[PDB]
Design a protein around this ligand. Structure first.
Ligand code: RC4
Ligand code: ZN
Length: 257
């Protein structure tokens, strides 16, 4: 199965998932001088006050904090989006070193990690149906740089010991994702895809310009997780990011002048 090692990493994915070489793959490099300000972009609306987190799971390629999306609680709307998108989960991609780890890059700059808050278009009824649509998901991407600790991230860091290996999960209720957002909601947006197999081209990417800062100790704990299952040879969960893909026939739009 696919992963991030030399023998099953990003360069191999196209054999089982031909869409890997598709027309709207993610991530991409964001060339800040080429992205054009779009005055028509409506303001972004992130309404997470009623978010209901439930569990945290190590799925063998990252850890997902899952939410109750059986009702319209936490939603994302506005910006380039038509309609309402419901939060279902968030996860991160990070490196073995502070100098790499993000999937999107800014003028080729790689951040230490990148957070993906995943939302699905409620007009499609459920997540599985949504990923089959070009406007099925809206993912909010937030860069992480190493510096001061992010208070709102500590509850996540402290539970990682309990989900060290693939397939382990733990109760994770009452977590407030608002604590993972930067001050400004200025963003870049473009049509793209999931960055892991099946690599479906169903995502409207909304990548925030302002990164959040996390401490070296916080990201060091991410790097202690395992890709393997319990009782298997230890493979540290690091560098679970896909590199920038061809922009092709797409334009990245900026929400700010
Ligand atoms: C085997 O994987 C699946 C099987 C069946 C279904 C319906 C969905 C998936 N995968 C999926 O949703 N991935 C996924 C979801 C959200 C995001 C990413 C990947 B990302 O681009 O990294 O960040 C945001
Ligand atoms: Zn992701």
């Amino acid at each position: 199965h696919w992963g991030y090692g030399k023998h099953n990493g990003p360069e191999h994915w196209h054999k089982d998932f031909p869409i890997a070489k598709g027309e709207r793959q993610s991530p991409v490099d964001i060339d800040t001088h080429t992205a054009k300000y779009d005055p028509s972009l409506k303001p972004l609306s992130v309404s997470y006050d009623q978010a209901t987190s439930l569990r945290i799971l190590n799925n063998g390629h990252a850890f997902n904090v899952e939410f109750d999306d059986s009702q319209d609680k936490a939603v994302l709307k506005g910006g380039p989006l038509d309609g309402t998108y419901r939060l279902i989960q968030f996860h991160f991609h990070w490196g073995s070193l502070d100098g790499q780890g993000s999937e999107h890059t800014v003028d080729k700059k790689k951040y230490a990690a990148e957070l993906h808050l995943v939302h699905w278009n409620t007009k499609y009824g459920d997540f599985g149906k949504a990923v089959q649509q070009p406007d099925g998901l809206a993912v909010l991407g937030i860069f992480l740089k190493v510096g001061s600790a992010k208070p709102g991230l500590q509850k996540v860091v402290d539970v990682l010991d309990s989900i060290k290996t693939k397939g382990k999960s733990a109760d994770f209720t009452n977590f407030d994702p608002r604590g993972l957002l930067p001050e400004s909601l200025d963003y870049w947006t473009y049509p793209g895809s999931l960055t892991t197999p099946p690599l479906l081209e169903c995502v409207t990417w909304i990548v925030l310009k302002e990164p959040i800062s996390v401490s070296s100790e916080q990201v060091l704990k991410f790097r202690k997780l395992n890709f393997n299952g319990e009782g298997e040879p230890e493979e540290l969960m690091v560098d679970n990011w896909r590199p920038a893909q061809p922009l092709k026939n797409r334009q990245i739009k900026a929400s700010f002048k």
